[PDB]
Amino acid sequence: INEVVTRECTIHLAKRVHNIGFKKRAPRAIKEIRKFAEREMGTTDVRIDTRLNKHIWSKGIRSTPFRIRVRLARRRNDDEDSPNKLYTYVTYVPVSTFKNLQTENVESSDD
RNA sequence: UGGAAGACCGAAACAGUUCUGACGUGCAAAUCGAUUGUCAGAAUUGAGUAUAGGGGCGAAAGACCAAUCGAACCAUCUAGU
RNA sequence: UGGUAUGCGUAGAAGUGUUUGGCGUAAGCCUGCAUGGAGCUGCCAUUGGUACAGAUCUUGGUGGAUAGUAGCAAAUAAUCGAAUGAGAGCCUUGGAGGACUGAAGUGGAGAAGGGUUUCGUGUGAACAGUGGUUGAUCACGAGUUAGUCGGUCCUAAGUUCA
RNA sequence: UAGUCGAUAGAAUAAUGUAGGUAAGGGAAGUCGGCAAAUUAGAUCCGUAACUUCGGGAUAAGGAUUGGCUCUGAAGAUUGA
RNA sequence: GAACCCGCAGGUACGGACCAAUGGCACAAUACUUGUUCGAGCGAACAGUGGUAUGACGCUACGUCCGUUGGAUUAUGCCUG
RNA sequence: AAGUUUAUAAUUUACUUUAUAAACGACAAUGGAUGUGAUGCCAAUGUAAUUUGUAACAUAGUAAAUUGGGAGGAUCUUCGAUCACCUGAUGCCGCGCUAGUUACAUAUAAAAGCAUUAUUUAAUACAAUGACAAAGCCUAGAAUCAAUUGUAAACGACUUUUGUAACAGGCAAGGUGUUGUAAGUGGUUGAGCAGCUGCCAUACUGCGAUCCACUGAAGCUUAUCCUUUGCUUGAUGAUUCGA
RNA sequence: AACUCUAAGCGGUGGAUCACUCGGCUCAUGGGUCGAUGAAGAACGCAGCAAACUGUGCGUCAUCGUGUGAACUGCAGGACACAUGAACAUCGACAUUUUGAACGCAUAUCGCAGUCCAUGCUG
């Protein structure tokens, strides 16, 4: 049951990050953004964009942005077929002031 | 004003005070941390070089002389008793 | 080992595994079966480097500890992630990204030392107490050009010796 | 800047550790012993003993003060009017 | 001169709980602050938790709360004999 | 001398209680059996590693079945959604009959064996268990792993979890905290300072810690906060177990 | 169940045991054969392919002469020159590096002279 719908989802990193050892704070942030992505889209195959890279990592490892605005896009696995016909594509939509945003159901496929 | 001193605090440097700490089948047949002595001179040190076994060298502990010193190491006497 | 059974023997010797059967109080013996491949044994005398469980024995091998318990922990230490491959956190690598040593350097040169270790290419097992396509590994090639820099020469401490 | 990011890693991040800290109130009662730890520390100013070989003791003791901004003064060089 | 059982309240020592208050710790939370870096600024990063003031979910103290009631019968006092 | 009882006279729920008379006077007895609801080894009138079958007489005298209702019982025990007892009703298979005495007939028995125990039985009876193909009745779980909670924890384990809803999870929102007034913008707030000065009042243009207003704000909020007709999303893996 | 124990079969692990051996060991026998005419030993470079062993020295895995008479051999260049010779032995003719007694002097230097003869260049 493929679905292949894209929505821009909400993650508060800070709680997950809380009391985890520094320097492992954002190797845990990336892993947890995958964990959230995997729970939402149901697809084990999580890909994280190179735009997503820089937005966690700008403010260097001790001060990971407490709340992050996520774009989660469930897409079809093309060539050399993974056992999971789906993959989720995770990118950051560049906002400095994420709070107050509830998740919205349309990103049109070919951005 | 000047800038003396085997002067003092303390780096590089050298050493190893106390924890009688870590380690102590370790990284290491002597290391590691903290702490600390000394640091312009009887200082620190490289290379070349001299001194060789019952000998040397010793700011002298019987310390050290190639992880070895109350007499090195190696072979032989020696399958010593 | 001398003699002997006109001994046995590649048609399977010796060796050896062996809930084969049996003998002897035992030391030990024979035989079957399987394996084997090139030589061997009984008896009478004859000689010994002659029989092993040990000697904090020797030498080689192997267990329990323990397919994992010590550990592989100091210098924070990664990480997104593109490429490739049999496999890729490192090691292959860009881009990116967190930092490190913090010019008294984990830098840039040389001596003392090293000895091909430098470098390209190939790149697998072993090695890198982890992986490892990569390396100071492993395989295959190349490279160190001087009248002026050192050695050379010179003397020192000191030495070789007519 | 140049060079690293290799010190096998991940998840958990238990006890006990190690290495680094903090702890009211009391404040060495602890212990062999203030060991370990803490206080103290730079600078400028003020003040400064016993004792003394008159050099020191001395950073004695005991006190004050230190940011930022905004002003002000002092401290030099050279020709010219 | 019975601090003597009935009766009453408190504490001690021991033990077990519990974190509300109060106190302790640091979220490397928030602020402030120094040194440096991001052109400055915001907001951060680095000083292996940078320091300092405050400091919650949470843990935990020195904090507080809770710790039963009979029989058998010893010692012993006794009946009847 | 502790004591088992009977009976008469009383007495009682209780071989209890009272008086009279006796009695097994820890005898020998008694302790196996009164098999004490008089078992067996009987039924079998030939009792048997065959079963007996069939006739009469008279005495004693036997019983086979079913259903309903009312009350009762259970201390480690072979079926507490079980087994009784009593009472009433229904009918009729007459299925059995036994003991005594007596009639009639017969298979086993003649198991060779003269040494019959030896290697030492099983038709049968009763009790349990089985299950090949098949047959006759009844009924349609969960556990554990993954994922999940934190009340739990080194790891297992413990405690929670998963119905398009009592949902569960990630947010945003709100409550609750914590710190202490953000950015940005405006103000001569502001000791002051530079630099240009008019045909006349004079000043302005920048700089300036900090203050004020927007701003009891901004940030942070529990992961081990509380809450949600708000948002979106999940709802789609593994193994094994029986009387 | 799993594991453990005990035994057995089979597979590993491991190289004992046996049988073999161009070697070792000991006794006996014959001979006397290093060197300034430059030794023994060392270093160095050498095979078509070699890195060693072994062989050799710049003529480098070997050359004359002599004997025999067709290989070497892993692959090959070769093989031809098998009748004048392979290849091995013999090895009496030569070569026999840099050294080392080691000899011009030295040697953490393959370093530095002198002399005679000789060559090229320049003249």
Curated annotation (Swiss-Prot):
Gene3D superfamilies hit by this protein: 3.10.440.10
Question: What domain of life is recorded for the organism?
Answer: Eukaryota
Q: Which SUPFAM superfamilies match?
A: Ribosomal protein L31e
Q: Name one GO biological process term.
A: cytoplasmic translation
Q: Which residues carry this modification: Phosphotyrosine?
A: Y89
- Enumerate the InterPro entries for this protein: Ribosomal_eL31 (IPR000054), Ribosomal_eL31_CS (IPR020052), Ribosomal_eL31_dom_sf (IPR023621)
KW Phosphoprotein (keyword) present: yes
A Gene Ontology term for the protein's cellular component: cytosolic ribosome
Q: Which UniProt keywords apply?
A: Phosphoprotein, Ribonucleoprotein, Ribosomal protein
* One annotated GO molecular function: structural constituent of ribosome
Q: What family does this chain come from, according to its entry?
A: Belongs to the eukaryotic ribosomal protein eL31 family.
Q: What is this protein called?
A: Large ribosomal subunit protein eL31
